[PDB]
Symmetry: D2
Subunit: 249 residues, 4 copies
């Protein structure tokens, strides 16, 4: 459809929001490349998607992996029209219990990996290509034990504002999708190792959304598709928040 004839790269495409986004973009006719660290999930994701979705085992935090990943895109497709820097995660640590590892792990995948994924992608991206970063409402709010994650997500949104000007000559527009609480494996894992612990954590998080439910991952993916499509032609540097109103109220 609108994305037909377009080449899309979704980092962290093997599960959750990155998975649903790869599905939606491909359903619009785009050629999608997805990345994951675990070979088994990547193979299941490629098989579940079908529709000419290409899988590459890559770690966004490893600079050499990014070089290899973009080489496969250059060798096969030869261009990148859509980039969704989805690969990221959250971990909880209250102030007074923040380890250097906890800080470094969050920033390397949530922020550093975003910077160098984007910088490496650029030679492939033509004029009028679209870049989508994954933010969070936690980037604009405060939650106990979430300061490090929240700071990383705020850093992500901040990158898009300056990159508007850095990429103005090349004609690529960069925007941010900031999801609210989305039903994923990653969100469930915060609730615990136990199944009641993940079930009760998802239920409390749902109770925080004003419409009263968690998002299905497809609901975030529609937002990425919109930014990937030509309809977003006048959107640049913007944050689109789909949170059921949680951070809007």
């Amino acid at each position: 459809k609108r994305l037909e004839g377009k080449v899309a790269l979704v980092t962290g495409g093997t599960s959750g929001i990155g998975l649903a986004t790869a599905k939606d973009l491909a359903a619009q006719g785009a050629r999608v490349i997805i990345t994951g660290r675990r070979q088994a999930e990547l193979d299941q994701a490629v098989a579940a998607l079908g529709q000419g979705v290409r899988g590459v085992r890559s770690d966004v935090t490893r600079s050499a992996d990014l070089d290899a990943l973009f080489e496969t895109i250059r060798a096969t497709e030869g261009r990148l029209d859509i980039l969704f820097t989805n690969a990221g995660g959250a971990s909880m640590a209250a102030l007074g219990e923040i380890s250097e590892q906890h800080f470094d792990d969050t920033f390397e995948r949530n922020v550093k990996a975003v910077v160098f994924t984007v910088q490496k992608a650029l030679p492939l991206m033509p004029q009028g290509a679209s870049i989508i970063l994954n933010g969070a409402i936690k980037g604009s709010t405060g939650t106990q034990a979430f300061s490090i994650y929240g700071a990383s997500k705020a850093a992500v949104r901040a990158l898009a504002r300056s990159w508007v000007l850095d990429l103005k000559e090349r004609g690529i527009r960069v925007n941010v999708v900031s999801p609210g609480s989305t039903r994923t494996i990653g969100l469930a894992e915060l609730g615990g190792d136990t199944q009641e612990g993940q079930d009760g954590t998802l239920a409390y998080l749902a109770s925080l959304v004003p419409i009263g439910r968690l998002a299905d991952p497809s609901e975030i993916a529609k937002v990425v598709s919109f930014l990937a499509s030509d309809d977003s032609s006048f959107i640049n540097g913007a944050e689109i928040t789909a949170d059921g109103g949680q951070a809007q109220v």
Copy 2:
């Protein structure tokens, strides 16, 4: 392509500019569109240019009786509203120390008060799962000389959506805001002055302020509204979507 087919949309101020293009894009997606304007002549041209089962009503959003008349027509003609775009609005310039009571009253009556009662009057028609789009501006979040009244009215519109999220939770109607940057429109051109050379230097100057360096086509604003009108925005509530070429984002 029939994305909004079977849905009923109302665009206040549908006869020109952003409202016109939005009515077009909604109709191109299969929606039944109702448009309003103050001038019957432009309204007739707009309805004729759109075709596609677009119904026109001449009404002023600032007149409470017109709003009652307009929604009575929707109730008999279609019997429901699924999409509402409170586009009718305008900007005027007056610096602090030159602000007239006229200038304040007109700006807030159309830009804010009419938005409240357009929305309030439309609620009985709107079913669960309906989408409301208010027309903001980046000027609601920025400062420009001689624009304090317009910018303040636009900030008020965005604020209304945050509380209306909670007010409309039981009915299931979601409220969002599109904040345009500089979009080429008769409205925007007329801000430059009333002479023809004067409007072009204003349109070119406004383009020079945009980071991508061009004014928006009205259709590019309309695509954001259609997205908000469609079910793809199902998890968006109370949010502001800014399409400004990055002007207010930097």
Copy 3:
């Protein structure tokens, strides 16, 4: 004595935040004028404040009252260094029950009166004068049945951004203090006429503040005093939020 010799006007100085702000400004050496609609409360306020505080009975919504008040300042003090457009209020109406009177009254006092207080004040204000607008966190947040008040307070804050450029030649800086929930007569009145209803509503509102208490008006007054002093020389068009962290999280 940061305000020694400075002339300050607090509209709606007879109760709550405006009263404590007048008390605080005078305690720093300012010459303070306060206004109120009710003659009895105004006289009581002037007597309690002492410290050379002058009261004028005037309504911010009546243009002729606005002319008469500023004529007294020109005749008496001869200039105006600090302006606090405090006179304001909140009323409740959900969508579907908003009357035209509820809208008009809210916007006339909270927005229109702010505009014309400022514009009429300008001829008395010298270069380096300070203008403080009274915002609210409700201007940036969502609360049920508060849409009209919330929009008026957002309008107030936006006025400041443009007034930076309008007043740059005159040399006046405009800033906003946005209070969170502050224990005042006006706020208690939202709780009801009964004392038990005021006790439950204020305690509930206190539970929403992350620090867990309502502000005393003196805590808001300090923010105004800071903005009025020369310490705010590089602050212009900004919003200073004293909410105990409520809208910050």
Copy 4:
């Protein structure tokens, strides 16, 4: 003498904003500790301030240096009422020229050292203490070649929102001062080694401010002193922007 009886630590106290803040904090009666990497300026800073201002040669990025610094405060002063995490910097790299070191250097000092400066200080801080983090308007704006610096500053602001909830039991309030363009050595250095290159950039930066001048470091310092004082008791998680209206407009 509002801050008299209070112990203040300013990282990066030997020059610029941190120096002016150390001056202003000490002028209010606080016992001030300043840190710098270079012994020479740290000695010049301590001697120029006088007023019992104590200097420690420490690097905020060195965990061992931080440990020693707080040990001297615990051994000498014994408590910390005010924390200003000022030590930080900007460097420019446009997208396509961002080095991995440039990212790491920026985020080490501006974000990581802030996290661990605060975490190590906490055991010394009594209930009612005030923490001030140093942001920037660039954390909320976009400038060509400034994405990493802006992203670091946006992360600082996000840290305060969550830290409000983390520190609520301790009763320590966290706020952020976000300066606009301030006349400092660091700002001049962005104009490069050449003298007229530094003058030409600084006047250009002054032209970007709506009031049309750069801030003196004392104007930012007044904001910090206000947040350090008890006058800010109802401010928590807030950002106070002193930018001459640049990001406000």
